[PDB]
């Protein structure tokens, strides 16, 4: 009837302190060792460290150690994850789980984890509200776009010359740097004949700012 | 002490049978025990086997294991594939000390034709520069299944300083989406003679070049 049940998401800032919990419930929390694990947005797991509450014996991958802290208060079931000073490169999904995958002609060893914490997203972020800039990108068939550069928060909208123009319009998702900001791009796919007698205009509007640019993009 | 690498993705049809490798850096792969871990977009991890070819308690038959002394490598074979298979897979393994994760292995339960990606390559706009930056954008699209690998290359040399790249997205017509981003300065930009976007999908790499010199 096992449980590892973590607290909630985690909406923090640069420099702040956080301390996260994992509470396990339906069996001994002192006869088994808590592991916690790290996986970053569209990244793998990576161990982070191991805890046996029954004496606070803790250790920590070598990736890890003196930039994190584990502890447990057995008294309450509850293994804690804690970072004194969080990094914008801190925010991800953080797992808890239990040690208790055993191998049967072993019966004192424990190998793998075999129950896991729900998770506890963490993000963090120092970017303040920010309008985007944008770039022309210029061109049987062309392609040309709008860079849309260095904006906070999401969304932002792109259109192509008032909304007159749909046909071949790909806004692509925005990427999430490693600054905090948002970029994307939009293009548009349009015949190559059009590129001497139409003009292309991107439309961008981003409310949170109030930015409004509209870019002419020029062969 | 050691690495585990698997492929970054792997696909094949409904009813058909696939396999997952993980190879082992440093020391043999036999001298400690692979675990299989299933995890689905959101859900939490979940073992598959463990004990190398071992099957937790109600993971059907369909899942098996395998160890490969010659290559140094463990294996997840999943038969009689089916659509809630599609998920990320990960090997895993101990040091005696540490353990060890593979880096995942996306797998995709095909449910149309394998698509190559078309790629799009935009060198800095010339009113760009003049605010002193630089950006390379390629942009990646109709991709199946979704799951690519994107390098960037000056001249001959990777590069992976000043490079941000999303996940893949779904887009309005079921394939998939995906971009990528190159930070320079001008000078940077003006001093090699050209820039690479590579997109690996399925094993073949899709290529384009810009140039300094138009």
């Known amino acids: 009837e096992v449980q590892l049940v973590q607290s909630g998401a985690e909406v923090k800032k640069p420099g702040e302190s956080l301390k996260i919990s994992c509470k396990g419930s339906g069996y001994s929390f002192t006869s088994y060792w808590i592991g916690w694990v790290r996986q970053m947005p569209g990244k793998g797991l990576e161990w982070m460290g191991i805890i046996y509450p029954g004496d606070s014996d803790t250790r920590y991958s070598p990736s890890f150690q003196g930039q994190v802290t584990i502890s447990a208060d057995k008294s309450i079931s509850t293994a804690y994850l804690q970072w004194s000073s969080l990094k914008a490169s801190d925010t991800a999904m953080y797992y808890c789980?239990?040690?208790?995958?055993?191998?049967?002609?072993?019966?004192?060893?424990?190998?793998?984890?075999?129950?896991w914490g729900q998770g506890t997203l963490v993000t963090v972020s120092s970017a303040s509200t920010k309008g985007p800039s944008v770039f022309p990108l210029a061109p049987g068939t062309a392609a040309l776009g709008c860079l849309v550069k260095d904006y906070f928060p999401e969304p932002v909208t792109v259109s192509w010359n008032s909304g007159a123009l749909t046909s071949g319009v790909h806004t692509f998702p925005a990427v999430l740097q490693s600054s905090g900001l948002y970029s994307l791009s939009s293009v548009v796919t349009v015949p190559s004949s059009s590129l001497g007698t139409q003009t292309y205009i991107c439309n961008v509007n981003h409310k949170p700012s109030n930015t409004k640019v509209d870019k002419r993009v020029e062969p | 002490n050691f690495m585990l690498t698997q492929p970054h993705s792997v696909s094949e049809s409904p009813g058909k049978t696939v396999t997952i490798s993980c190879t082992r850096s440093?020391?043999?792969?036999?001298?400690?025990?692979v675990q299989w871990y299933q995890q689905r977009p959101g859900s939490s991890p979940t073992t598959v086997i463990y004990?190398?070819?071992?099957?937790p308690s109600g993971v059907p038959d369909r899942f098996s294991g395998s160890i490969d002394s010659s290559s140094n490598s463990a294996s997840l074979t999943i038969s009689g594939l089916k659509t809630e298979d599609e998920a990320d897979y990960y090997c895993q393994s101990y040091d005696s000390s540490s353990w060890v994760f593979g880096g995942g292995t996306k797998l995709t339960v095909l449910g149309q034709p394998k698509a190559a990606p078309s790629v799009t390559l935009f060198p800095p706009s010339s009113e760009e520069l003049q605010a002193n930056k630089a950006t390379l954008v390629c942009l990646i699209s109709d991709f199946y299944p979704g799951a690519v690998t994107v390098a960037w290359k000056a001249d001959s040399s990777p590069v992976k300083a000043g490079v941000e790249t999303t996940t893949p997205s779904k887009q309005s017509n079921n394939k998939y989406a995906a971009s990528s981003y190159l930070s320079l300065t001008p000078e940077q930009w003006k001093s090699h003679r050209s820039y690479s976007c590579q997109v690996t999908h399925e094993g073949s790499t899709v290529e384009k070049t810009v140039a300094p010199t138009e």
């Open positions: 789980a239990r040690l208790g995958g055993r191998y049967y002609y072993d019966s004192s060893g424990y190998y793998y984890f075999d129950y």
């Open positions: 440093s020391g043999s792969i036999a001298s400690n025990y």
């Open positions: 004990e190398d070819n071992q099957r």
